[PDB]
């Protein structure tokens, strides 16, 4: 049960140094 710690904590980086 990893899907928030590593599977979504990358992929929603992308959209914050993107975005901020």
Same mark, same amino acid.
């Given at each position: 049960?990893?899907?928030?710690? *590593?599977?979504?904590?990358? *992929?929603?980086?992308?959209? *914050?140094?993107?975005?901020?």
């Amino acid at each position: 049960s990893d899907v928030r710690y *590593n599977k979504s904590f990358i *992929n929603n980086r992308l959209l *914050n140094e993107h975005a901020h």
